[PDB]
Design a protein around this ligand. Structure first.
Ligand SMILES: *[C@@H]1O[C@H](CO)[C@@H](O[C@@H]2O[C@H](CO)[C@@H](O[C@@H]3O[C@H](CO[C@H]4O[C@H](CO)[C@@H](O)[C@H](O[C@H]5O[C@H](CO)[C@@H](O)[C@H](O)[C@@H]5O)[C@@H]4O)[C@@H](O)[C@H](O)[C@@H]3O)[C@H](O)[C@H]2NC(C)=O)[C@H](O)[C@H]1NC(C)=O
Ligand SMILES: *[C@@H]1O[C@H](CO)[C@@H](O[C@@H]2O[C@H](CO)[C@@H](O)[C@H](O)[C@H]2NC(C)=O)[C@H](O)[C@H]1NC(C)=O
Ligand SMILES: *[C@@H]1O[C@H](CO)[C@@H](O)[C@H](O)[C@H]1NC(C)=O
Ligand SMILES: *[C@@H]1O[C@H](CO)[C@@H](O)[C@H](O)[C@H]1NC(C)=O
Ligand SMILES: *[C@@H]1O[C@H](CO)[C@@H](O)[C@H](O)[C@H]1NC(C)=O
Length: 517
């Protein structure tokens, strides 16, 4: 397939054609990273929701595969859609789906039923019901069989939330080694609370606890996850819940976004640390301070120091309207997950997880150092559309702001600015003049996230630009900002900008990135 379209991320996953949303079924198994995703096999907007499927060996070079779970009744009246969920390798055959020595992969997902019906299990479902169901694969995730005999395995929200039958979704299931049980986290979306169940067999589930609401509550809760992450460089660990909400994303944004909670998990209950939850319903721990990072899900099948989340690089506010063709939506750079103690508190730090040496050389295409970068702009350099920029500079700078102008037209009237506000100690990403901003009133905006300098007073930014995206990793990765952009074909220039004064101890390096397709 030819992936050379305007706006087509060359190192971000997108389907060849049609609509994609949430990542699903993230599983590393037998040297393969599976990427399933909410997918419309019949169109460029949301609908006919199925699990699409791609694979890679390195989170970088994706190969799209046949649809894994195809909306039941696709091509006519749809009777069941395959909403979001997760996947595991049932290596001990606890589910009994194994056959001829081959052990099964098992997906757990929300069945969405557009019509009232009686299912092959004998269960009866209401119009627009959401329930949790399972499927299995005996060919390493290539084809799938739905558990028609018993689905759904969790028909109803727990008492007293039976009225929430239409909003009960996004099961994240995993093996909990310590309690020797399967654990699943689901979202009672409208009530901003998660319900946790355990099982010995992936089929029979027992309600064990509920979590929330805490912190951000300005939208429905979706895509819960729970994982144990290393803290700093010793032996200590913490458990982390990631969950999205739509709308009510990070400050300065309108629409969806991803928050997190740091705490402990005993196999049944997640206890948030006292300092991870804040009075009220607004203040939160943001996984990403930008507008385009949602439905972030974690990989099953990875060890303590190797955890990876994948997020959807779009926003529900305007996601239907981005000017992409023949596909719509991409996933963000996969995110390595860990904790570091920053300012006396356990803080999520992400690292851009792709096989960068396979597509990007360590010889920079552009390299400069300035003991004192003059006020104003440097001369133009050409970057093309796909590149990484590393910047470092002194927090002691005299300037108001230091920034790079990215994906800019020759005269820089079109450009995306990524920079640092010295007084406020904030990264900013200004996409107000980034290109096509015509499709939503809230798109042409400036975004901000907190970033303190390191111990030596050095501020570091690592910036990834692809055909329709900028991702900023600040510091050690404690602050990320993810934003789509839609620049014109000539928008391949860059320069540095020191506003209000000079910038001290500047290092800028730009590295070309090649296509993964
Ligand atoms: C969910 O997916 C379905 C696909 O299964 C999407 O529906 C399709 O939408 C596209 C537009 O993107 C339509 O494409 C048009 O097709 C025109 C010709 O249509 C006739 O010929 C088709 C091939 O034989 C045939 O399938 C189609 O039948 C459909 O419409 C009939 C009404 O006339 C109806 O009686 C049938 O039941 C059936 O629904 C027609 O006879 C062509 O002239 C256009 O150029 C254009 O390509 C498809 O026809 C749609 N396919 C179907 C099966 O309906 C749907 O949009 C998706 N939903 C969402 C929300 O995205
Ligand atoms: C599959 O079965 C194996 C063996 O019964 C389980 O591995 C055990 O895990 C416990 C706790 O982590 C260890 O103390 C044991 O040493 C392990 N057993 C052996 C012999 O290796 C495993 O937890 C089961 N589940 C999955 C999904 O792998
Ligand atoms: C958040 O709190 C405000 C009061 O500060 C209240 O008006 C609003 O209803 C709350 N939001 C939710 C979802 O409870
Ligand atoms: C930028 O560099 C070009 C090519 O080296 C040069 O012609 C120009 O004078 C430089 N500065 C200006 C004025 O933009
Ligand atoms: C900048 O260049 C573009 C053409 O690429 C043009 O449309 C625009 O008017 C120019 N802006 C100014 C103020 O020169």
């Amino acid at each position: 397939f030819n992936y050379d379209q305007p706006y087509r991320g060359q190192y971000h996953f997108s389907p060849q054609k049609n609509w994609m949303n949430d990542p699903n079924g993230l599983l590393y198994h037998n040297g393969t990273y599976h990427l399933f995703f909410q997918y419309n096999p019949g169109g460029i907007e949301w609908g006919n929701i199925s699990w699409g499927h791609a694979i890679s060996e390195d989170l970088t070079h994706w190969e799209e595969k046949p649809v894994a779970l195809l909306a039941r009744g696709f091509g006519s009246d749809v009777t069941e859609m395959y909403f979001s969920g997760s996947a595991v390798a049932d290596v001990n055959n606890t589910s009994g789906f194994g056959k001829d020595g081959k052990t099964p992969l098992v997906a757990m997902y929300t069945s969405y039923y557009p019509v009232a019906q009686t299912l092959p299990s004998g269960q009866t479902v209401q119009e627009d019901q959401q329930s949790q169901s399972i499927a299995y694969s005996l060919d390493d995730g290539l084809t799938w069989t739905t558990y028609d005999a018993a689905n759904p395995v969790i028909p109803n929200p727990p008492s007293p939330y039976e009225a929430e039958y239409q909003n009960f979704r996004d099961p994240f299931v995993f093996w909990h080694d310590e309690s020797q049980k399967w654990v699943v986290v689901t979202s009672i979306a409208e009530l901003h609370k998660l319900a946790i169940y355990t099982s010995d067999n992936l089929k029979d589930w027992k309600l064990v606890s509920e979590f929330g609401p805490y912190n951000a509550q300005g939208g429905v809760w979706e895509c819960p996850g729970l994982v144990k992450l290393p803290l700093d460089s010793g032996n200590s660990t913490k458990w982390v819940i990631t969950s999205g909400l739509n709308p009510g994303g990070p400050p300065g944004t309108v629409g969806s976004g991803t928050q997190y909670f740091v705490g402990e998990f005993d196999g049944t209950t997640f206890t948030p640390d006292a300092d991870t939850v804040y009075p009220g319903n607004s203040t939160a721990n943001w996984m990403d301070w930008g507008p385009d990072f949602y439905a972030a899900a974690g990989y099953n099948g990875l060890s303590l120091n190797d955890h990876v989340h994948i997020g959807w690089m779009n926003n529900w506010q305007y996601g239907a309207n981005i000017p992409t063709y023949p596909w719509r939506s991409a996933m963000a750079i996969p995110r390595h997950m860990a904790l570091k103690t920053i300012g006396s508190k356990a803080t999520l730090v992400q690292q851009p997880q792709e096989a960068w040496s396979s597509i990007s050389n360590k010889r920079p295409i552009y390299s400069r150092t300035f003991k004192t970068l003059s006020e104003g702009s440097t001369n133009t350099t050409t970057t093309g559309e796909t590149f990484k920029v590393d910047l470092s500079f002194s927090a002691k700078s005299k300037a108001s702001t230091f920034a790079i102008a990215l994906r800019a037209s020759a005269n820089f009237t079109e450009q995306t600015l990524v920079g640092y506000d010295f007084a406020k100690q904030q990264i900013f990403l200004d996409r107000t003049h980034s290109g096509d901003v015509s499709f939503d009133e809230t798109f042409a905006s400036v975004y901000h996230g907190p970033l303190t300098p390191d111990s030596t007073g050095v501020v570091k930014l690592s910036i990834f630009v692809d055909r329709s995206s900028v991702e900023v990793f600040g510091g050690q990765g404690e602050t990320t900002l993810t934003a789509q952009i839609f620049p014109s074909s000539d928008a391949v220039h860059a320069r540095l900008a020191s506003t209000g004064g000079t910038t001290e101890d500047v290092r800028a390096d730009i590295y070309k990135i090649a296509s993964t397709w």
